[model samples]
Target: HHHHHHSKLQLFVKASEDGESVGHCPSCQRLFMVLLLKGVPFTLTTVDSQLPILLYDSDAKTDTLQIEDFLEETLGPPDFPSLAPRYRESNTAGNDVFHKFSAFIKNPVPAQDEALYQQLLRALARLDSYLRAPLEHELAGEPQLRESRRRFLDGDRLTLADCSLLPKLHIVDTVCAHFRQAPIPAELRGVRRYLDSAMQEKEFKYTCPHSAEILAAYR
Candidate 1:
């Protein structure tokens, strides 16, 4: 008889084994939830390891890039067909956008900093001014509209970008809505529309059911 080395399909969540809190790991959670939504099987494992491996449809710590490679090699990279290039571009662009927006999520607010609170309000105002209406306007613009149609509007099945964006849109719509007493700037029209579309997705609604209430208090 020949020796056999068996490889099984196992999904592992390499989280904290002895930690009080997993902390605010929204991104990882979003990925995990999306997998669940798609009926992709996984097993959650919290091991006492030095390096935390977030999500895997397979239980192998081949390193970060390898994880994504394995996904592509196995499931393929989130199939939604506008074209190959569009998907690649969306992936790249989404990553860049997240980098820019992560600051808001990770803002350093001291326990009792009244001044900082005011600053955050100013930040919110700036977002309302910059993104509110201009984005929708741009989407209407032929060049932008065409691009959006290719990237988002022609949605068949949700892509990686859609999953990535859902969390950000959810956070904004939920958190910002509650936090601000002043009328939302008229300019944020595009943002509203975009997020509205995202909110309609069943997965988006399920992940943060208390989002509205939670956001209201913060505002």
Candidate 2:
């Protein structure tokens, strides 16, 4: 067989039992956002099982586990003009929120689990704080053409860190709305602002699952 210079990229993500592409899982969302935000050309398939997988035909790759690992390898360094610096740090922060949020997703609140509910809220608060001054100061000295007019978690440009968190934040909104019949607290300004800014990104708006689908799943 002849080898072509360019090969197709395909991603496998989870779908609801009903075959609808919505909140059956979140890990896939993370991958979806990154690929879309980074402008990687790919096709999506929603599977009932064994999802969140990436298939790429490159010098070094195949069936990678953990979306983060795939991103690290495929994306090379964070200094690339299209990528963000300190991606590892941003990914680490994203993991912090993911683990906590996973617990809530698996077992939603208002079911006599006050501690669990509070924990989720606190996690969001901590994430909000992290998104504020600390992360800003951390990135203040990093190299970039200019400031990102938006309040992204890492810096002006949307890094893998932003990609990592955006999907989870969507999940946060869906989960909170379903449980409390309300949106994330207004006081969580950092979280709110980030979401607002991120949502405006063409990549984010286009890649994210439909709002109706998400609402239906949570409700």
lDDT of 2 by residue, 1-219 (tens): 111121166677666546655434456666676666555556777766355676677532333245556665566545323455554455555456656655766674558466666777787887777566445454465545232334777765677667667877787787667766647788987778888888788766766776666666656
**Candidate 2 Cα misplacement greater than 4 A, ranges:** 1-7, 15-24, 47-49, 58-68, 75-89, 101-112, 134-150
In terms of lDDT, the poorest run of 10 residues in model 1 is 1-10
Q: Which candidate number maximizes TM-score? A: 2
lDDT of 1 by residue, 1-219 (tens): 111111233433333223321222345445544454545445434332422243443345534344434443555435412222233433543343343333443467665345544454454444333323223434555544432332132233455556665565555545544543333345545445556666666655554434433343344
**Cα RMSD (Å) per model?**
8.8, 6.2
Cα lDDT for residue 73, candidate 1: 51
Pairs in clash, predicted candidate 1: 132-187, 132-188, 132-189, 133-187, 133-188, 178-216, 178-219, 179-219
**Structural similarity to truth (TM-score) of each candidate:** 0.49, 0.70
